[PDB]
Symmetry: C4
Subunit: 388 residues, 4 copies
Amino acid sequence: RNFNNLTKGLCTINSWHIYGKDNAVRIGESSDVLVTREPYVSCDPDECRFYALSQGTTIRGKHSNGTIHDRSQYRALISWPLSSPPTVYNSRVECIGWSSTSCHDGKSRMSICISGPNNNASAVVWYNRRPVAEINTWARNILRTQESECVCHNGVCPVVFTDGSATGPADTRIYYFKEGKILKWESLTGTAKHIEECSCYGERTGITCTCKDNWQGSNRPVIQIDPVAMTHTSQYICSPVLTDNPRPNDPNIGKCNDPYPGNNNNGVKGFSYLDGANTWLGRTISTASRSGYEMLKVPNALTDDRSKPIQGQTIVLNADWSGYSGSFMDYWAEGDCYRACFYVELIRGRPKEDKVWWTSNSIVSMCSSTEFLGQWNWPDGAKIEYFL
Amino acid sequence: RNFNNLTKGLCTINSWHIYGKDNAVRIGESSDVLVTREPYVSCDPDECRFYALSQGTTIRGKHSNGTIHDRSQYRALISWPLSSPPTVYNSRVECIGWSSTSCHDGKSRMSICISGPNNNASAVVWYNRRPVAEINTWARNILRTQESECVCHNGVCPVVFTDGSATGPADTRIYYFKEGKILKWESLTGTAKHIEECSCYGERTGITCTCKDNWQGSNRPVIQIDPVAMTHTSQYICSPVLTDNPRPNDPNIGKCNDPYPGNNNNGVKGFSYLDGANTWLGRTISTASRSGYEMLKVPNALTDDRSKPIQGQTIVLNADWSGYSGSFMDYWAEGDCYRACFYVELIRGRPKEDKVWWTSNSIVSMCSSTEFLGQWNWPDGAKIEYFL
Amino acid sequence: RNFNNLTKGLCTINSWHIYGKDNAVRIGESSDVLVTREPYVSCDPDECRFYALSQGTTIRGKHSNGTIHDRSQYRALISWPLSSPPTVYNSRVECIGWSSTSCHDGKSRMSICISGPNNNASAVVWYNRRPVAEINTWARNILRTQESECVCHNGVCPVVFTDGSATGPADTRIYYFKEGKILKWESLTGTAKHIEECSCYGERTGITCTCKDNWQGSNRPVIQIDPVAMTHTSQYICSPVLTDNPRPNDPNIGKCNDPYPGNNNNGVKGFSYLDGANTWLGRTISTASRSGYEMLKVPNALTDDRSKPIQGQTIVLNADWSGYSGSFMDYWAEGDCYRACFYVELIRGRPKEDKVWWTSNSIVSMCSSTEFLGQWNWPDGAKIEYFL
Amino acid sequence: RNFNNLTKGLCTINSWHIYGKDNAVRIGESSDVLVTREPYVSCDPDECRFYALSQGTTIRGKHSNGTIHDRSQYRALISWPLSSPPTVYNSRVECIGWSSTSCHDGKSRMSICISGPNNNASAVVWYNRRPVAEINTWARNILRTQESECVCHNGVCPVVFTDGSATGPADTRIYYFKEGKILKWESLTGTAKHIEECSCYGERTGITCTCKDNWQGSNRPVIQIDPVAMTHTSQYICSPVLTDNPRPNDPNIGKCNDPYPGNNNNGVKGFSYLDGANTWLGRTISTASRSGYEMLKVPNALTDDRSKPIQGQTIVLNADWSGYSGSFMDYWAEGDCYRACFYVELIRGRPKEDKVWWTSNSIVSMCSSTEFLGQWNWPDGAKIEYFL
Ligand SMILES: *[C@@H]1O[C@H](CO)[C@@H](O[C@@H]2O[C@H](CO)[C@@H](O[C@@H]3O[C@H](CO[C@H]4O[C@H](CO[C@H]5O[C@H](CO)[C@@H](O)[C@H](O)[C@@H]5O)[C@@H](O)[C@H](O[C@H]5O[C@H](CO)[C@@H](O)[C@H](O)[C@@H]5O)[C@@H]4O)[C@@H](O)[C@H](O[C@H]4O[C@H](CO)[C@@H](O)[C@H](O)[C@@H]4O[C@H]4O[C@H](CO)[C@@H](O)[C@H](O)[C@@H]4O[C@H]4O[C@H](CO)[C@@H](O)[C@H](O)[C@@H]4O)[C@@H]3O)[C@H](O)[C@H]2NC(C)=O)[C@H](O)[C@H]1NC(C)=O
Ligand SMILES: *[C@@H]1O[C@H](CO)[C@@H](O[C@@H]2O[C@H](CO)[C@@H](O[C@@H]3O[C@H](CO[C@H]4O[C@H](CO[C@H]5O[C@H](CO)[C@@H](O)[C@H](O)[C@@H]5O)[C@@H](O)[C@H](O[C@H]5O[C@H](CO)[C@@H](O)[C@H](O)[C@@H]5O)[C@@H]4O)[C@@H](O)[C@H](O[C@H]4O[C@H](CO)[C@@H](O)[C@H](O)[C@@H]4O[C@H]4O[C@H](CO)[C@@H](O)[C@H](O)[C@@H]4O[C@H]4O[C@H](CO)[C@@H](O)[C@H](O)[C@@H]4O)[C@@H]3O)[C@H](O)[C@H]2NC(C)=O)[C@H](O)[C@H]1NC(C)=O
Ligand SMILES: *[C@@H]1O[C@H](CO)[C@@H](O[C@@H]2O[C@H](CO)[C@@H](O[C@@H]3O[C@H](CO[C@H]4O[C@H](CO[C@H]5O[C@H](CO)[C@@H](O)[C@H](O)[C@@H]5O)[C@@H](O)[C@H](O[C@H]5O[C@H](CO)[C@@H](O)[C@H](O)[C@@H]5O)[C@@H]4O)[C@@H](O)[C@H](O[C@H]4O[C@H](CO)[C@@H](O)[C@H](O)[C@@H]4O[C@H]4O[C@H](CO)[C@@H](O)[C@H](O)[C@@H]4O[C@H]4O[C@H](CO)[C@@H](O)[C@H](O)[C@@H]4O)[C@@H]3O)[C@H](O)[C@H]2NC(C)=O)[C@H](O)[C@H]1NC(C)=O
Ligand SMILES: *[C@@H]1O[C@H](CO)[C@@H](O[C@@H]2O[C@H](CO)[C@@H](O[C@@H]3O[C@H](CO[C@H]4O[C@H](CO[C@H]5O[C@H](CO)[C@@H](O)[C@H](O)[C@@H]5O)[C@@H](O)[C@H](O[C@H]5O[C@H](CO)[C@@H](O)[C@H](O)[C@@H]5O)[C@@H]4O)[C@@H](O)[C@H](O[C@H]4O[C@H](CO)[C@@H](O)[C@H](O)[C@@H]4O[C@H]4O[C@H](CO)[C@@H](O)[C@H](O)[C@@H]4O[C@H]4O[C@H](CO)[C@@H](O)[C@H](O)[C@@H]4O)[C@@H]3O)[C@H](O)[C@H]2NC(C)=O)[C@H](O)[C@H]1NC(C)=O
Ligand SMILES: *[C@@H]1O[C@H](CO)[C@@H](O)[C@H](O)[C@H]1NC(C)=O
Ligand SMILES: *[C@@H]1O[C@H](CO)[C@@H](O)[C@H](O)[C@H]1NC(C)=O
Ligand SMILES: *[C@@H]1O[C@H](CO)[C@@H](O)[C@H](O)[C@H]1NC(C)=O
Ligand SMILES: *[C@@H]1O[C@H](CO)[C@@H](O)[C@H](O)[C@H]1NC(C)=O
Ligand SMILES: *[C@@H]1O[C@H](CO)[C@@H](O)[C@H](O)[C@H]1NC(C)=O
Ligand SMILES: [Ca+2]
Ligand SMILES: [Ca+2]
Ligand SMILES: [Ca+2]
Ligand SMILES: [Ca+2]
């Protein structure tokens, strides 16, 4: 086995095809399905799996009461087979904590979980299912990380962390791991003014992370990482097609080096694929809440502050709840290009559906096609009334 | 590992022995058993498995309400160990969709799932558990496929698709895949006037598919495929032993090149083994509904429009519900011949049993014996009253 | 991998130690545990497993109603990990039927299941998880077999079958299989007058089977099989220590070549280890019913019609229900001798406990020790009242 | 594969990081989770697993009534994947009994279970999942062992057993096993006056076991084992930081060679890492009951009768129930040192919480870090009221 190298460009994205969907909430109405949130997808060289943070209880279990809560001692990063739901009997625990990232380097998988109280949190880095390194909070204010997969190149797997305020300047760091060991870390540089929950992907040009500015900006900050030199830059997506939520309406001039104003102290984890004329952006349909999801083809969105959509695809209808969204790719697939993929978290329960006392989600996932495929919409599909 | 080649003839069929039965509905009265329909069986070189389209809910789950529905976003092709029931915890998702086929080529398995709305459906072709190719609807009217296993020869796995009307002329295509890639496709040729849900098997003479004419014919259309030349022909089973359902009574002259008339706009997926004097046909016992199942030995049924049965075997009593039936064989078994096998879908629930609000099924499966074995009958075995 | 050869003698049996116990009925009060009966244990070269005939329903399931029934289309031979209970999610189906045997030859496992109606039953022989040969009923009266493991030598695995009356002369055959193929079969010879449900084990002296005479004898018939010559002889255990159930009291002279009289048309499957001064016999404690179980050291029981016990061990108290018992050994263990093992079926429910409507069992298993270990008793442990 | 050798020293312990937590009681409120107690953790070279003694019933099962009981025929040592809960479907039975130890020697795992009545108990030694040796009670008064992992060096795995009184002088033996065979055993020597439930770990200096004096001492007895010479010595932890429970308040002079007095005929299984200036001791926070848990850095605790803490870490708050605690290490991890680990048993139910009729537990586990990480507290997390 060799470390994987990012040697391919992205496949041309002409549409998106269904890749995975677990229907977890539907099935969990009558099955031992774990309550989760903050899910993602990540591939090994021989298998792709669903990942999420469990709440240490099933949905029908009485302990599901109060699972809107973000950070308890009963959370853990679990993984489970593609498109199966996260059950008590099929879920593998990667590590314990309430914020996570995970990626395979071609030889073995690194998983990182953060746990602790707000002022004394710590990250534990697992490599090949063993704890290897630990990192203590540096700002003493909810040390936290990506909530989607990291990406590796020749053994080096960069990870973005934030520690500090969610509503002001915070201390963001980029760590560079190899076999779970810390090679190097650096403070965030560039023009991004606030960084949360980076969604990343890799290709020959390097590693690209699309994140969340929770403080002031409804445009998304971007961090571009060189995994060989172990350095990075940051800015925003220049495009006036704004992709955070909640957000103002799309203007005609975006902002490259500062937050686009209108909504403060809120946001959602999201993603984009930034690739010249092959650029696609994901966003919720609603500008007010985490509902609906669509992909928009926006040529040169990263660099062009006038850029608008020329093609699109609805993923989830606005009538249906969405949530976090993030990127991943099967870096070990056949062919000459990397096929862009993403997942959307379909949040059910609180705060939007408060007739139940829990909060959970299911997953839908798509990958790009070079065909121009017909589109459908993909709801969670559970009826809240059944849980009453 | 090498691609499998169709080098053997069929074993002599003197009777049928029990091969597999999951008792899914009985067990699912009190277990987390997924609601399914459209099941089949398919073998890998080291394992044979049950396949079906899940409805993304268990039977006892409240979301089982309304599972008579054919095409939702909550369906997926699942596979599970032979004769076990399809449970939440033991079922592996092959792909997402509401119509499917799957087959192993000796090296890896290809699975195809179709999804989307009626006018914008698309097929995704998976090979070795990764998406490889995609096909958009060409007639914009429920792009759909076999609902039983395909067959491969030297890496080439032909698959039959239909897109268009179910009650008139439709656009049927034969696709030829290798490692999930499209080598070639061709429009349906020959004398078959309507094609649905082909059940196929392979032997040295080529690949034989017995399908369903839903439009006008109660005799079954046959497609014979050369997987080397990648061409095919079509006709009907000439025999007056009619095998669709519903159907007229058996006349004394069948039809080779046109539908036998009497029942329009209906039918059931079925199968046959067409092999000269070793020919056996499957059919429901009832001519009015999907109840009972029997095998009939009808020499030269394919070519002889006067041919009648000389031997038979009851599989399911007429008092018991049946459903879809299809062919498969263990192409990797020991010996000098391929042992013909089939499954019968035992549909429980709606529309025939409407005291419950769900629709599901169990599976029974048989293979041929060169002995003349005693016969039994194989009901689903669940009591509807228990679910009330 | 090589075929296993019976090259060792039995280890000296000075006592019995606990080997396995699944507590299936206790656990199945609140878990998806399959209803079973007729269990056994059998080893592969890398694993030992529990085996039993499922009833195609869980205990709490409403379909457990009526599981006193012996032969339905919903039964199957299942196997599952040692000391785990037989659950819906962990049980592997070996074949479909209501009477069975199974054994590994060192290369692969042969499993045989019989199914059908009383007058038209058939056996299907599976080898390496594929059906290989089939045998039709020869007496048309419940073709049936061992209900415990067979034994192999150099690829040859003898199996005892009976077809015909249970209350009169029947047609017993000894079949000799290799890789699932029939090498030879022969009619029962010797002085045993009726044969049911043989429990067998192998050692350098050959294969020894202790069976059940259901017709007239409360002593047990013995069949001794030469697996190289593929021949056998039969007689009874000469000892006046009688081991069937129900049975008369122990006299002072047993019978070597005819049934010991007193109880007609009844009996239980049981076993013995017949090895000169190392002979141990198993029996129920009660002479009237399937309750309790004890092992008795009876030197030369096979040949000495005056032989009495000189040592013993209680396995299950007379206050507790027992049932079938049979032999197995780990033929692939380290050392210079084969360690004698056995299981006892602990039957719960009907007909003895008719407040519930089901019939099932758990398993307890022991192996011999060269130490003189303290003894305990091993009840099923479930409280019937909980199921009410 | 080679036998593992203890060639490394302990890593420097500057703090403790979260390693594993199963949340078993929370999840078992609504899942088929086995009732357990006396858990531990033990590693294979490719996997680390949770271990515990099952009670042969789930928590919601009615048979959970009365599981405060220590020694029934329905107990078994089970193991299951790290941080998953012990479920009916994911738990592997290692052996049958009500007291246990287990360890991997680098080639295969040895497991030992004791069973029987108080006056006739016996140990069965399993190696590579097969029973190899048996040991009968020598004092006829609850033959019993460690309840946490043993440790091996070059194939030799020492185990501590006690047989006899819990409230007076008993017969403690140290056994030395290789591949499950008894190489040697010896009577307890040294100054420890009573030995129960040793928690052991290995490093280049040998094997160190921290045990429990149930008779008179609230300081802990220590047994130091040379696995090459197969000899040992014993004494107490000299430190006045007392670590049994219940216990007197910490004085300023401890006792090296006799029990520290104050609490008779009680105690809890616990552990320590005794390593000069790298010494850490675990104890309950309360001096009266099994509540809370903390680690204390006490330089030279083993030899210095004046030694006091200079650093510490709270693991479980005093408001939360704890229980048994013990040591383990991943002897097959990368690096130049062995990372000290421990688990704490979080007992829920009786006798402290008698509104429910059962007794069970969950597990929390930690390993050492060379960082000085922030601390959290780790409760079981279940609400008793939910089970009412
Ligand atoms: C079967 O399946 C297929 C495959 O999915 C289906 O085909 C798909 O159909 C959908 C639905 O229409 C399409 O999605 C939309 O795409 C358009 C972009 O394409 C249009 O515009 C292109 C660009 O035009 C500009 O440049 C060209 C030159 O480059 C110039 O000629 C032109 O004049 C103009 O200057 C055109 O090139 C393009 O034409 C091409 O494609 C046509 C088919 O689409 C074809 O007919 C032509 O021949 C040609 O080939 C086409 O005209 C996106 O604009 C659109 O996204 C907007 O609208 C949706 C609502 O539907 C909304 O959700 C989006 O967010 C977005 O609108 C918001 O943002 C805008 C940008 O800021 C803003 O301007 C809007 O006002 C709006 O903003 C408001 O809402 C948002 C969101 O809440 C909020 O944030 C704001 O603040 C504000 O409130 C769709 O993505 C697919 O592209 C199309 N795919 C294919 C392959 O055809 C087919 O329909 C299915 N069949 C059936 C029977 O169902
Ligand atoms: C233990 O197990 C064994 C093994 O299973 C059991 O043995 C089996 O028993 C069953 C039940 O009888 C048999 O199935 C039937 O087979 C017959 C065919 O065999 C008969 O006919 C043969 C052909 O005869 C013709 O040609 C020969 C020369 O070739 C000529 O001599 C003769 O005069 C005639 O011209 C005979 O060769 C054959 O004899 C041989 O076998 C005998 C045993 O069967 C043996 O005794 C002889 O010595 C000799 O060796 C025998 O006579 C099928 O015809 C039949 O299928 C029809 O009937 C069933 C109802 O049972 C029905 O469901 C079928 O659909 C079908 O009938 C419909 O279709 C017909 C064709 O279109 C039509 O003509 C009918 O009117 C009818 O149509 C109506 O219903 C259908 C369906 O709803 C509907 O679609 C129509 O519109 C319409 O409404 C059975 O398959 C097995 O073959 C037999 N197996 C063996 C190995 O023996 C044994 O019974 C068990 N033991 C116990 C104790 O239970
Ligand atoms: C800790 O654990 C250990 C290990 O388990 C426990 O030790 C065990 O204790 C049990 C219980 O006693 C023993 O089981 C019994 O074994 C005896 C056989 O051993 C006795 O007899 C031997 C033979 O004596 C004959 O020959 C010798 C010369 O060879 C001659 O000297 C003698 O006079 C006589 O002629 C003796 O050798 C033996 O002595 C040796 O062992 C002694 C310890 O046992 C020791 O003290 C001595 O020093 C010496 O070393 C000993 O005396 C079995 O006979 C007995 O089985 C019968 O009884 C049980 C009831 O307990 C019954 O269930 C059996 O079915 C059977 O009785 C029925 O069948 C008989 C034969 O047909 C019949 O004659 C009876 O009338 C009776 O029949 C009735 O009931 C049955 C069943 O329902 C029915 O079918 C009939 O129709 C009828 O109604 C037990 O198996 C273990 O052997 C012993 N093991 C060891 C290693 O010691 C220890 O107790 C535990 N400690 C504690 C504190 O609990
Ligand atoms: C973020 O996370 C971090 C990391 O966890 C948190 O930092 C941790 O904070 C905790 C809580 O304070 C600390 O745990 C305690 O550690 C002390 C030991 O350290 C103190 O004492 C050291 C030794 O001093 C002695 O020697 C030195 C020279 O060697 C001499 O100078 C000195 O005068 C004295 O002679 C000091 O070296 C040490 O200072 C160092 O560290 C400081 C930070 O701690 C730092 O500020 C300094 O600059 C310097 O670097 C420090 O002063 C333990 O003593 C203590 O354990 C006792 O107390 C707890 C209650 O909290 C109790 O549960 C324990 O059982 C124990 O107390 C019992 O036992 C004693 C011994 O027998 C007895 O004397 C007591 O009376 C008491 O006995 C009673 O209760 C018990 C239990 O029920 C019963 O059995 C008895 O019978 C009786 O009833 C704690 O373990 C961590 O060490 C510290 N870690 C780090 C890395 O800093 C941080 O707080 C978090 N941040 C936030 C915002 O929350
Ligand atoms: C990636 O690059 C390194 C260094 O050039 C090489 O040694 C390694 O084999 C490469 N990995 C793969 C999968 O080729
Ligand atoms: C099938 O035929 C091809 C081409 O003749 C050959 O290369 C291949 O090995 C064959 N497959 C098997 C299983 O023999
Ligand atoms: C199924 O759904 C319908 C509503 O469409 C409802 O009237 C009916 O009662 C439901 N059945 C059950 C079992 O609740
Ligand atoms: C058993 O005997 C045969 C023939 O003598 C030999 O070929 C085979 O290898 C033996 N099996 C084993 C496991 O040694
Ligand atoms: C441990 O030591 C022995 C004897 O010196 C050696 O043979 C063995 O290989 C060692 N084990 C390992 C894992 O190196
Ligand atoms: Ca924002
Ligand atoms: Ca038709
Ligand atoms: Ca009898
Ligand atoms: Ca004590």
